[PDB]
Amino acid sequence: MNASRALKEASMVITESPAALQLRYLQTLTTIAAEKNSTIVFPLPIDMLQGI
Amino acid sequence: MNASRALKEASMVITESPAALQLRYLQTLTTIAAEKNSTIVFPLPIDMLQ
Amino acid sequence: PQEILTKDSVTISVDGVVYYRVQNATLAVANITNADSATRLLAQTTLRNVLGTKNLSQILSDREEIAHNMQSTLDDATDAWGIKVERVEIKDVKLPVQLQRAMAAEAEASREARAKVIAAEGE
Amino acid sequence: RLPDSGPCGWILVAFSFLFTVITFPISIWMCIKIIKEYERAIIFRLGRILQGGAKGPGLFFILPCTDSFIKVDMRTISFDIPPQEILTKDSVTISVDGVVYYRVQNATLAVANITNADSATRLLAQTTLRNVLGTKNLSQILSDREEIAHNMQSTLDDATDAWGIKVERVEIKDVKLPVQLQRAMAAEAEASREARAKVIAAEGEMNASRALKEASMVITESPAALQLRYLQTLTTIAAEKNSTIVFPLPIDMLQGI
Amino acid sequence: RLPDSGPCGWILVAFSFLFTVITFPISIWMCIKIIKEYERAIIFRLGRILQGGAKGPGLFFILPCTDSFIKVDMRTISFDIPPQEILTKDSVTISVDGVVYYRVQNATLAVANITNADSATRLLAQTTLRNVLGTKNLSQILS
Ligand code: NA
Numbered sequence: 283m284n285a286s287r288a289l290k291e292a293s294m295v296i297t298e299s300p301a302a303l304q305l306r307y308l309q310t311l312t313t314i315a316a317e318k319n320s321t322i323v324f325p326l327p328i329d330m331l332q333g334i
Numbered sequence: 335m336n337a338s339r340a341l342k343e344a345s346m347v348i349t350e351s352p353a354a355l356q357l358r359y360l361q362t363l364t365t366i367a368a369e370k371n372s373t374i375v376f377p378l379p380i381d382m383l384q
Numbered sequence: 385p386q387e388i389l390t391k392d393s394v395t396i397s398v399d400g401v402v403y404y405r406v407q408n409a410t411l412a413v414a415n416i417t418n419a420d421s422a423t424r425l426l427a428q429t430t431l432r433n434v435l436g437t438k439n440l441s442q443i444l445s446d447r448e449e450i451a452h453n454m455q456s457t458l459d460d461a462t463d464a465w466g467i468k469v470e471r472v473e474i475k476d477v478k479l480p481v482q483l484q485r486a487m488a489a490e491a492e493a494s495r496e497a498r499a500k501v502i503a504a505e506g507e
Numbered sequence: 508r509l510p511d512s513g514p515c516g517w518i519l520v521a522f523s524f525l526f527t528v529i530t531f532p533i534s535i536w537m538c539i540k541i542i543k544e545y546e547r548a549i550i551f552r553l554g555r556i557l558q559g560g561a562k563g564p565g566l567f568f569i570l571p572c573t574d575s576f577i578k579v580d581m582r583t584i585s586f587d588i589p590p591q592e593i594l595t596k597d598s599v600t601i602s603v604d605g606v607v608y609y610r611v612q613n614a615t616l617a618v619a620n621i622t623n624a625d626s627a628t629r630l631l632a633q634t635t636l637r638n639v640l641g642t643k644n645l646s647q648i649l650s651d652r653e654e655i656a657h658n659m660q661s662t663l664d665d666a667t668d669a670w671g672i673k674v675e676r677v678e679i680k681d682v683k684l685p686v687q688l689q690r691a692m693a694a695e696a697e698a699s700r701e702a703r704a705k706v707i708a709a710e711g712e713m714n715a716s717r718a719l720k721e722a723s724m725v726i727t728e729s730p731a732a733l734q735l736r737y738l739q740t741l742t743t744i745a746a747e748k749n750s751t752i753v754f755p756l757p758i759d760m761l762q763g764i
Numbered sequence: 765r766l767p768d769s770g771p772c773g774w775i776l777v778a779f780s781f782l783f784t785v786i787t788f789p790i791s792i793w794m795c796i797k798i799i800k801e802y803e804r805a806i807i808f809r810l811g812r813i814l815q816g817g818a819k820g821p822g823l824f825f826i827l828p829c830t831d832s833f834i835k836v837d838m839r840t841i842s843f844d845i846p847p848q849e850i851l852t853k854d855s856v857t858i859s860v861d862g863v864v865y866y867r868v869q870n871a872t873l874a875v876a877n878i879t880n881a882d883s884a885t886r887l888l889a890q891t892t893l894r895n896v897l898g899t900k901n902l903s904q905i906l907s
């Protein structure tokens with residue numbers, strides 16, 4: 283409950299240029315990769331899959 | 335039962351803007367990654383513009 | 385040290401101390417074979433029993449009540465030996481390693497709640 | 508305040524007077540006792556305690572046959588308590604490393620009412636510290652020294668009074684969490700630095716964006732250029748010391764089924 | 765201020781004088797004391813401290829049979845504290861390695877009011893450092 287207001291404020295800015303959320307997504311991946319754990323990553327060419 | 339009221343208040347604020355809940359998801363993932371023996375499988379949808 | 389079970393069935397090991405004195409030298413010699421050994425074993429069993437009637441949270445909060453309970457048991461037993469037990473106290477308490485992080489959940493959660501507010505401000 | 512715990516005497520005393528005088532140049536050294544300003548003496552003669560309080564500083568005479576003599580230091584003493592295992596009110600496992608300061612307040616009780624004043628006092632300090640910290644949350648333990656000290660003092664005074672002891676301080680020199688809890692409990696500090704890092708990272712995205720747009724506008728004029736960039740990325744990744752799995756995928760063969 | 769802690773005198777002192785004079789070529793080296801500017805002495809005569817404050821620099825005479833002599837260095841001392849494990853206000857585990865500087869400012873109290881002044885001081889420094897850093901966030905500790 284205490285954290286919710288700031289997340290709403292952040293969301294209202296981010297949605298005005300929605301690709302910003304993908305930038306946040308990619309920075310999350312960089313943070314996770316640094317931890318001492320196994321990470322498996324799948325680059326996925328969706329327009330190639332859209333063809334079949 | 336005791337926790338439900340606060341979750342409702344948090345939910346009502348979060349759902350007023352669409353990206354907010356997604357930010358909560360990504361922060362959870364960052365919290366998970368610090369625990370031992372936590373494998374994360376991560377898709378990267380990419381467009382080659384054909 | 386002793387191995388103990390609480391009322392809520394938590395396994396804990398405790399490390400006690402006892403204080404006592406002779407108050408009737410005639411009974412201490414002629415009514416019991418070894419007054420010191422008898423007293424020290426009685427202290428252990430009395431501590432074992434009382435803590436089994438308490439939840440772990442009560443053990444941390446109810447020193448005065450626990451002391452009052454033990455004294456009645458000790459006085460009834462030690463009168464015939466010419467002994468007065470003055471205190472039984474606990475020096476250490478330990479959880480098994482497998483239980484330690486699980487039981488600490490409230491403290492972990494409180495710091496995690498403050499972290500979330502900081503992180504949301506970052507976003 | 509006394510502790511809670513004849514004709515033939517003159518014969519023994521006289522025998523002792525005679526014997527010491529008969530042995531004077533040797534035995535007078537045993538008879539003579541000197542007590543310093545900061546010391547006190549408890550003296551028994553034929554088992555009875557000499558009347559009044561503990562004997563003060565100065566020169567004193569005793570007979571080693573009939574008399575027994577105990578000398579008490581009245582100065583403050585400090586002891587380094589062995590480390591302890593403790594549970595907080597919020598059930599956190601911590602180990603603490605204490606120190607206690609204490610002083611003899613009444614020399615008669617310290618001698619004649621307790622078998623070993625030091626060990627009794629040192630054990631009592633440990634159990635009192637164990638109890639008080641069990642009534643506090645971990646955050647309170649770090650913030651509430653004055654309240655914690657006040658709580659302990661009243662407990663200690665009620666017990667040590669009968670022993671003639673005054674405890675002056677109990678303090679902690681180390682506190683440790685077990686290794687499994689250390690990163691979890693540090694969440695608030697870790698989050699603050701990550702929050703500042705995120706702002707720095709977003710400024711980096713903004714600064715780099717213009718050049719990526721310029722690169723994109725050239726690349727899109729012959730879109731197969733992006734596939735060339737894709738293949739050079741794969742070559743870079745394969746050179747790292749990590750596992751790579753590659754799937755050649757004949758899409759026109761899949762298009763047939 | 766003082767610490768919170770006759771015929772037989774004359775006779776015993778007189779005996780000591782005679783003994784030391786009879787042993788004069790041996791006694792010279794034990795009965796005479798010299799105190800530097802940066803030192804003070806605490807002297808007990810038959811268990812009673814000599815009147816006034818601690819004895820200053822100079823030449824002094826001690827009857828070893830009746831008298832006890834303690835000299836105190838008044839200069840600054842530095843000590844390398846062993847490392848400690850600490851928790852910050854934000855609950856970060858850190859280990860710190862400290863140093864303390866101190867000096868005696870009243871030689872009478874240092875001798876007669878505490879059993880071991882140095883050990884008491886060094887332990888007190890450790891606990892004081894432990895407490896204060898527990899009231900500070902890690903960023904405040906650095907700044
Ligand atoms: Na200690």
Ligand code: NA
Binds near residue numbers: 847
């Ligand atoms: Na040091």
